[PDB]
Design a protein around this ligand. Structure first.
Ligand code: IWD
Ligand code: IWD
Ligand code: ZN
Ligand code: ZN
Ligand code: ZN
Ligand code: ZN
Lengths: 258, 258
C-alpha cells in the first residue's frame, strides 16, 4: 500500500526543516528531492513514506562479501520500494536495480578554496602540495578507480595510497575539509553540488574547470518492480512540463546567498 | 540474424563517404553514429545493416491517421530492429518504443547569423523583424507546441501562424536559411548541432543564450525487443569508458574549420 522511499540527507535534495522537531512524517523534510517525490507520487497516485537510508550511503558492493550497501542495498534486498535521491545511473548498478531516464544531467567537477592555484585536473595531477579526494562509496570514486585516462589514472594512483585518507564519508565532510584546509585540499565532486555550495555562505569555494565526464541521476526501483514503468514515464512528463527546471531554480538560485 | 539499423543522413552523425559510389553496404557511410553503431554491435555481438530512413524524418504521429512516420515509424511497424541516430528521448515516443539511457545530453538553443541583435528567447518573442522557426516533425517543434511557459507559448503562437512557413524539412535547410537571411531569420535547434555548425565554414553563425530545456538522445528499439537490455548496458559501458566523449571530439572539434 504505502510506498517506502529511501533517500539521503544531502542539501538541497533532502534537508530537515528548521522547525522539524514539531513536525511528523514526510513533513519533517524539505528539498528538491522531497518536492520531486511529491510530484511523482501525485502523478502515479500512491501514498509514500520518506525514510533516510540507515547507513547514510549511496551504495557500493563489498568486494569480498558481494553485498550491496546504501540506497542501492535497500532496494536490492527489498527494504525499500523506490529511491528518490541524487543517485547516479551506472553500469554496475543497472545490473542489480532499475533506473528511470535521468532527471538531472551532471558531471564530476573540481571544488577549490578561493585563491587556490589550481585550474584543472591536469594541474592537480602534476603537483603534490595540494591534497585532493572524493566521496567514499559512490560513482565518483569508482570513476577514478576505473579510469584509463592518463591524468585521471595518475590522480587515482595518488588518491588510492594518500595518507591520511583523502576520501570522505559525506559531502559535507569534503566541503568542510576544503574550507578548513587553507587551500591545501581540493575536492572532486558532482557538478550540481559544487554549483550549489558556490552560492552558499561563507562564499569561500568555487568550481574550476569544466566537468570531467557526463552522467545522470535517475529514480531507482528494484529489478522487475511494477512501479518502474510508471515512474519512468512520470519523470519524462515532469521534465517536459518544465517542473524539473522549476525545482532546480527554486532550490539552487532563488536561495543563493552570494 | 542481421540486425537492421535505421538512421538518418544528418552531418556529422551519418554522412556519405566521399567515394561511397565505389563502396558497399556499411562502408558507404561515416560519422558519429556510424562509429557508435559499429561499437554497439561489437559489444552486443551482432551483425548489422545500416539503412537510411526512407522518408528522411525523425518521427511524429499524424493527428488524424495516428500513424507514426520517420525512424520511430520504422521501429513501430517492424521495418527496423534498432535506431542509432540523434533521436530525442520523449514521453510520447517512450509510449510506443523503448530507449536506452542517453548517449548525449543537449537542449534546444538559438542559432543566429553573426551580428543579429538577439541574445535570448525572450528577445525573439518580444520583436517581429527577425523571423524564427524549427525543424518540422521532431522534438523541437513539439516542445514549443506543448509548452505552457509564457515565453515559449508566445513563440509557438507566432511560429504556428507565420507565412511563409518558418519550419524547415531538414537541419541543413534551416542553417542555409539563417546564412542567407542577412540576420532576418534565427533558427531554434538542438544545442550539439548548433555547436557543430559554429565550427563549419563559412563560420558565420553562432549559438546565443542558454539552452531552453534539457534532454537526451537514446538508442531506440521496438517495445519488447530482446536487444533492448544489452544495448542499454553497452551505452552505459561506452559512456563510462570515455568513448562517447572521444567520438564527439573526433567529429566536432578535431575537424573544426573555424
Ligand atoms: N551521486 C553519487 C554519490 N555522489 C554524490 C556526490 I554530491 C559526489 O560528489 N560524488 C558521489 O559519488 C552516487 O550515486 O554514487
Ligand atoms: N532529435 C530530434 C530531431 N531534431 C534534430 C535536430 I539536429 C533539431 O534541431 N531539432 C529536432 O527536433 C528528434 O528526435 O525529433
Ligand atoms: Zn531535532
Ligand atoms: Zn505535476
Ligand atoms: Zn553522393
Ligand atoms: Zn569497443
Amino acid at each position: 500500500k504505502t510506498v517506502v522511499v529511501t533517500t539521503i540527507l544531502e542539501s538541497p535534495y533532502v534537508m530537515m526543516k528548521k522547525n522539524h522537531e514539531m513536525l511528523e512524517g514526510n513533513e519533517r523534510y524539505e528539498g528538491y528531492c522531497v518536492d520531486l517525490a511529491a510530484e511523482i507520487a501525485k502523478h502515479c497516485g500512491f501514498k509514500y513514506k520518506l525514510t533516510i537510508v540507515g547507513d547514510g550511503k549511496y551504495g557500493c558492493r563489498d568486494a569480498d562479501t558481494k553485498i550491496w550497501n546504501g540506497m542501492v542495498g535497500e532496494l536490492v534486498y527489498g527494504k525499500a520500494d523506490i529511491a528518490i535521491a541524487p543517485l547516479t545511473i551506472t553500469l554496475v548498478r543497472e545490473e542489480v536495480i532499475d533506473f528511470s531516464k535521468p532527471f538531472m544531467s551532471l558531471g564530476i567537477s573540481i571544488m577549490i578554496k578561493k585563491g587556490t592555484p589550481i585550474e584543472s585536473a591536469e594541474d592537480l595531477s602534476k603537483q603534490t602540495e595540494i591534497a585532493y579526494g572524493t566521496l567514499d562509496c559512490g560513482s565518483t570514486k569508482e570513476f577514478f578507480r576505473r579510469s584509463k585516462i592518463a591524468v585521471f589514472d595518475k590522480m587515482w594512483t595518488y588518491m588510492r595510497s594518500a595518507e591520511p585518507s583523502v576520501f570522505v564519508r559525506t559531502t559535507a565532510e569534503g566541503v568542510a575539509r576544503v574550507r578548513k584546509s587553507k587551500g591545501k585540499y581540493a575536492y572532486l565532486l558532482e557538478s550540481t553540488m559544487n554549483e550549489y555550495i558556490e552560492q552558499r555562505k561563507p562564499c569561500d569555494t568555487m568550481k574550476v574547470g569544466g566537468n570531467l565526464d557526463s552522467k545522470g541521476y535517475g529514480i531507482a526501483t528494484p529489478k522487475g518492480s511494477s512501479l518502474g514503468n510508471a515512474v519512468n514515464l512520470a519523470v519524462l512528463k515532469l521534465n517536459e512540463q518544465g517542473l524539473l527546471d522549476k525545482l532546480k531554480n527554486k532550490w539552487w538560485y532563488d536561495k543563493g546567498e552570494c
